[PDB]
């Protein structure tokens, strides 16, 4: 009996920052401990579909004082209710429960065949995606509560298991997890995984190389010290490694190019039409060219971009197998979609900078474009080269299949950008024109 | 009728965190507005004298929505009650009452002959003393709502009013106050003052000049660019200005040196004895030398050190007339005690650094001591020179009176340091040996 309303809309994992949330009270409460309670809250909004968020709620006192605002929830007849992801004693016990590995009533915990890192110091971690909030024990293990529960299974655990038991190097090794069978279906609630302390994002690392050419430019893409090409090639065989390993356990099948399905995507994209309608016949000509042709479908990442890729010493890591309709997310697909995602991300890394270099106006942005096109096409080459070096198959060798998915990822990029951010529209439109 | 007991021990201005309280109920309530209410709450413990805290309570909605945490007091059927300090429209009013300058029932709000700064964007300052909370309207003025009410007269206000009405350029012009005569004695509940934007502490400014000589040293105290001597001289005539101006309105009296009183101080100091007992006969010889001699007593600061002094563009400012037994604090004293405080503070500024330069070991700290003694004695000279340049009287001219109070301030410094911090003890002991 605690009015979440007020703080369940301050958090930065809450989706409906625009949605107008009418009352949003509990839909489940398992008493994990005398102090804790795994509360799964249901959020009813006028003019929307209900969303379900989870929160491990603690009472008593919720320090530190360095965390009152973010964590304090409300009065609780008559102790103070906050959330336990900010109580180091209460996080220790959640992690112990995952090692037992116990089952408190409905919420069932489960650990792999490893050795977890308890009696180690935990703080929260601050890059809080709308998916999640997460504490890190020591520098050894990182626990992650999935904030918005959608019915299991959950690929990010499903894949990191099959991929780590197979012993793929490119994966943050999974340790434990926990879920619950609310109503009909299961619900993956969180996972804990080996901690890649000393990491850096791919986008952040490409952004610094794209920064290099451009600043003090007019000196060639290959000649500059910042050259990402070598690192891009390594990232290629990294993504190819996980793909080939995933295909071994997941298996492969043959299916024809989703002509009518991907036509429906390009058709709906024309709803928020620009000059995209002018390209549409030329695009449709590229689509119906590959009609009645068979591809190979594996289990894949589903949402690859430089952001979902981390660099540690001694290796590239693939994370966030989100992937993005949970049924549709698990469905297999051509790996040409994943290499399309990375190649798509390279152009965005190079030209956000050029927009930030149109920032940054006025006279000769024409030089920067020349360097960006150089950089964009060179690391895409270096990436494909490295991918092809790992598995016998070369993605560019079967170019027509790839060029289709690149065009599709641009149509989804246009619509996803155009609605949210008008300034982006030149990036999808120009790149559509480039291909 | 809101139940405070549960959150008036949660605020961290609450004194009795280690007292153990019983019924902590309200003992006054003047309704300032429709939404507001000045409420002096009385805390009745068992085994410990009662205290009294205040809190202006607002009822309705309480945003900012990010601050319902440190605010939400209780649910008084049926509107929520919370403290108004986290409300900008409610402090705008608490200020517009001090400007009125109104008087609601018991609580009288007074203002000086100035113009306060309402309709100016306010936030609360997180540097919140166990005495206070405070909001800061723009870069213009700073309100300060005393959280615990001890019975007047709060001499920091009494000595600020007198000085600013006198038109002293060396203070933080007092803009308004407010108070109430509860039971018998009066209670000063708050004050608002001219906000010194673009300021810097004296200690922080001396620390940077003491940093200069020492780093890249062996180059003389006068030759280095960092030389504080010029600024010290200005600070001299600044302190002398307020003293002479204070004596005009406060008046002067003649009294003999507190031989038996200051003997009791040196006697109690010997309780936590070191080598201080060896100096004690030589110190007592300096004390009983000035016995049966008359001095001049004015109203004074009482607690001068470089920390209680601020520098703005176009002038030095004296703040925190704390001063430090409220009866004893208001009692007049020789201004030689205040110049003793500043000269005492110069040595601490120079040798904290030398301890931080013993930090910072090992071979030739003997060089740093040579520079420190140079710096300590030169800015003490420059300060006394500037003081003497303002008022006809020179403090060093009547040296014996000053040398006594310097020795006393060292005995209080030794005992105050020794109990709290053992590492300090060489500073008082060595300086006692120096004088």
Curated annotation (Swiss-Prot), chains A, B:
Belongs to the aminoglycoside phosphotransferase family. One of its GO terms (biological process) is glycogen biosynthetic process. Catalyzes the ATP-dependent phosphorylation of maltose to maltose 1-phosphate. Is involved in a branched alpha-glucan biosynthetic pathway from trehalose, together with TreS, GlgE and GlgB. Its EC number is 2.7.1.175. GO terms for molecular function: ATP binding; kinase activity. Pathway: Glycan biosynthesis; glycogen biosynthesis. Pfam families: Mak_N_cap. SUPFAM superfamilies: Protein kinase-like (PK-like). It comes from Mycolicibacterium smegmatis (strain ATCC 700084 / mc(2)155) (Mycobacterium smegmatis). It catalyses: D-maltose + ATP = alpha-maltose 1-phosphate + ADP + H(+). This is Maltokinase. Monomer. Disruption phenotype: Cells lacking this gene display maltose accumulation. The gene is mak. Keywords: ATP-binding, Carbohydrate metabolism, Glycogen biosynthesis, Glycogen metabolism, Kinase, Nucleotide-binding, Transferase. It is an enzyme of class 2 (transferase).
């Amino acid at each position: 009996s605690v009015e979440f309303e007020d703080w369940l809309t301050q958090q930065r994992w809450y989706a409906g920052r625009n949605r107008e949330l009418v009352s949003a009270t509990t839909a489940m409460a398992v008493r994990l401990r005398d102090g804790l309670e795994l509360v799964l809250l249901q959020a009813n909004y006028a003019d929307g579909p209900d969303e379900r968020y989870q929160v491990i709620v603690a009472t008593g006192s919720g320090p530190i004082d360095e965390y009152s605002v973010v964590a304090t929830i409300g009065i609780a007849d008559g102790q103070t209710a906050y959330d336990a992801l900010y109580d180091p004693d209460a996080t220790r016990y959640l992690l112990s429960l995952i090692d037992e590995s116990a089952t408190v009533q409905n919420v069932r915990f489960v650990r792999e065949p490893d050795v977890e890192l308890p009696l180690d110091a935990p703080p929260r971690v601050f890059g809080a995606e709308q998916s999640n909030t997460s504490v890190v024990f020591g520098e050894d293990a990182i626990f992650k509560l999935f904030r918005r529960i959608t019915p299991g299974v959950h690929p990010d655990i499903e894949l990191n298991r099959v991929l780590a038991r197979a012993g793929n190097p490119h994966v943050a090794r999974l340790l434990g997890s926990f879920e619950t069978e609310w109503e009909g279906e299961p619900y993956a609630l969180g996972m804990v995984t080996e901690f890649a302390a000393n990491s850096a994002e791919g986008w952040d690392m490409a952004t610094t190389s794209t920064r290099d050419l451009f600043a003090e430019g007019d000196l060639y893409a290959e000649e500059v010290g910042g050259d990402f090409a070598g690192e891009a090639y390594r990232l290629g065989e990294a993504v190819a490694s996980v793909h080939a390993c995933l295909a071994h356990e997941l298996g492969t099948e043959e299916v024809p190019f989703p002509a009518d399905v991907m036509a429906q995507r390009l058709a709906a994209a024309v709803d928020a039409v620009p000059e995209l309608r002018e390209h549409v016949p030329q695009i449709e000509e590229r689509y119906h060219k590959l009609a009645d042709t068979t591809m190979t479908v594996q289990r894949v990442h589903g949402d690859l971009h430089l952001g979902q890729v981390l660099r540690t010493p001694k290796g590239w890591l693939l994370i966030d197998f989100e992937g993005e309709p949970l049924d549709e997310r698990r469905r297999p697909d051509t790996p040409v979609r994943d290499v399309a995602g990375i190649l798509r991300s390279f152009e965005y890394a190079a030209h956000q900078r050029l927009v930030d270099q149109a920032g940054d106006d006025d006279d000769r942005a024409r030089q920067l474009a020349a360097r960006a096109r150089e950089w964009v096409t060179r690391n895409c080459a270096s990436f494909c080269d490295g991918y092809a070096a790992e598995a016998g198959t070369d993605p560019r060798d079967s170019a027509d299949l790839l060029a289709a998915y690149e065009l599709d990822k641009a149509v989804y990029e246009a619509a996803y950008e155009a609605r949210h951010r008008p300034s982006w529209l030149p990036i999808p439109l120009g790149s559509i024109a480039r291909l």
